[PDB]
Design a binder for these strands. Structure first.
Ligand SMILES: Nc1ncnc2c1ncn2[C@@H]1O[C@H](CSCC[C@H](N)C(=O)O)[C@@H](O)[C@H]1O
Length: 388
DNA sequence: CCACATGCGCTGAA
DNA sequence: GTTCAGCGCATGTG
């Protein structure tokens, strides 16, 4: 029939917001979504990716595949030979083995080359690390010389350069999608970002940059992210694809209240010691009030009203600990609620929870690293493919 | 200079 | 090596 098979390759895959968004819109597009491959080295993300996206996977105690050597328990550092031994002969090893075998996980982007990068990819995503780009962090940036984690962007450059020479034009990925944080468009980062856009044109791609807020895509979260959607020059001509004006999109509001889960056994914060003020609403529809003498870290010092939207969920720190005011008291958004906040489903969260391998704080960590799924649904909805 | 808005962060002690 | 409570300022707009 006219079912189009869509082969997706996810670099820096995390828990697969990209794959989730494609499977969500697939039926409406008459698409069949297929794993071409992925690159993710973070043990908790990989386990969780498998939990969320597997069909009929049955975990068991297994030896770790002998070439699974570049993986990380914290997402920043490679695991030692000893840490690898500790994963060997466990249920967790089976998740890592399954990711390799069934999802074609290549684990470490540095280990990706023209000899293992799949041909004929329809959608190639690269949500590269934001650490050195985020305004919340130290802003070391992405200068090539510095070899930073956000600088792993230049590994994507390497890969494209390599495959350009060995692949036919038609074997090159059809669509590319970058995601990163808003500070990528800062004055200090523009030089590097512009250098990247010029390389993409060098590689035969036509691109558009979008700065999109999750709050405009049916979410109760202020989260501004930069996307660079690219289309291969010739495929643009063959399809007649045109870039949509996604920055003009505004959907109906959603409030924090709309995703909250009722419980009788929540832990409430004792804030009796701290002076406070009326709630105040900013232009963005964040309704918040400060806690005085709480900490010296600004972003930690706010309680949010559930009748507005909330702040960007971060993996760690202040914005991973989102305090909301409810009738029963002030509490943090829970891991379930953080999954819902990134527009994953309750069933997605239950699958990760049921693995019994991911702590509550690690579940928030991987949610905070992710992308709100309906932003991606909106972007992927604009894509065109040539009829079979 | 100011007031305001906002953050897929970092790390050392236990 | 883990883990997370305690910790600040960058990058804006007006
Ligand atoms: N050398 C490397 N190889 C593969 N993955 C890497 C890497 N360095 C960092 N990463 C991963 O890149 C990710 C950036 S966050 C991306 C999250 C993803 N878009 C999602 O849906 O959740 C992190 O999960 C981090 O573990």
């Amino acid at each position: 029939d006219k079912i189009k098979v869509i082969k997706v390759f996810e670099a820096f895959a995390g828990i697969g917001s990209q794959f989730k968004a494609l499977k969500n819109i697939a039926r409406s597009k008459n698409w069949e979504i297929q794993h071409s491959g992925m690159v993710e080295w973070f043990v908790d993300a990989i386990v969780s990716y498998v939990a969320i996206h597997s069909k009929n996977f049955n975990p068991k105690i297994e030896r770790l595949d002998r070439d699974i050597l570049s993986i990380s328990n914290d997402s920043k550092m490679p695991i030692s030979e000893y840490g690898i031994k500790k994963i060997n002969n466990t249920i967790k090893a089976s998740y890592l083995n399954y990711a390799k075998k069934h999802f074609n996980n290549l684990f470490d982007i540095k280990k990706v080359n023209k000899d293992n990068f799949p041909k004929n990819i329809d959608i190639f995503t690269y949500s590269f690390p934001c650490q050195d780009l985020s305004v919340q962090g130290l802003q070391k940036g992405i200068d090539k010389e510095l070899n930073t984690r956000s600088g792993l962007l230049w590994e994507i450059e390497r890969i494209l350069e390599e495959i350009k020479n060995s692949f036919s034009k038609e074997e090159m990925p059809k669509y590319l999608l970058m995601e990163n944080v808003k500070n990528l468009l800062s004055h200090k980062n523009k030089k590097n970002y512009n250098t990247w856009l010029k390389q993409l044109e060098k590689f035969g791609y036509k691109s558009k940059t979008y700065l999109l807020n999750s709050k405009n895509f049916d979410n109760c979260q202020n989260r501004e992210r930069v996307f660079c959607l690219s289309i291969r020059d010739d495929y643009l001509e063959k399809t007649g694809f045109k870039f949509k004006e996604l920055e003009k999109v505004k959907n109906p509001p959603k409030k924090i209240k709309d995703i909250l889960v009722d419980s009788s056994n929540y832990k409430y914060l004792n804030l009796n010691k701290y002076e406070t003020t009326t709630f105040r609403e900013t232009k963005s529809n964040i309704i918040s009030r400060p806690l005085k003498n709480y900490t010296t870290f600004n972003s930690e010092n706010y309680v949010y009203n559930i009748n507005g939207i909330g702040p960007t969920l971060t993996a760690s720190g202040a914005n991973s600990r989102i305090k909301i005011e409810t009738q029963q008291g002030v509490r943090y958004l829970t891991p379930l609620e953080c999954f819902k906040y990134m527009q994953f489903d309750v069933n997605d969260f239950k699958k990760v929870q049921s693995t019994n391998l991911i702590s509550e704080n690690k579940m928030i960590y991987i949610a905070g690293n992710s992308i709100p799924v309906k932003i991606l649904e909106a972007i992927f909805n604009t894509l065109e493919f040539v009829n079979n």
